[PDB]
Design a protein around this nucleic acid. Sequence first.
RNA 1: UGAGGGCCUUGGUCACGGCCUUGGCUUGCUACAAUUAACGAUCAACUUAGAACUGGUACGGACAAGGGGAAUCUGACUGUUAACGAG
Length: 31
Amino acid sequence: VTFDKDSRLDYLTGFHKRKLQRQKKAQEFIK
RNA sequence: UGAGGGCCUUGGUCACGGCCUUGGCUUGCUACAAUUAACGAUCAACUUAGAACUGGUACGGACAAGGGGAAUCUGACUGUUAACGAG
């Protein structure tokens, strides 16, 4: 394994886009 | 070429005007053209329907009800750290 800055920035800076993406997927599935 | 009207006139007749007779614009019948009258004339009819000045549109620029975010425990419970609950 390796330690890469891009992956850690992607994980840390997010936590909000992922949640809204999951909400959109659930909403469209319900529709 | 026959008829009817108009201007002429000639004799006889009755006191300029009647009566009886004599010879020279409309319409009728026939003969050759026209049938693109597919034209012209005349009488009679005919007047101007338009009003109103409503909004939603896509665009350009600020408001919009109001402190936000993440993860766990937990409650009914699908096809991705799923979702949901003003827990």
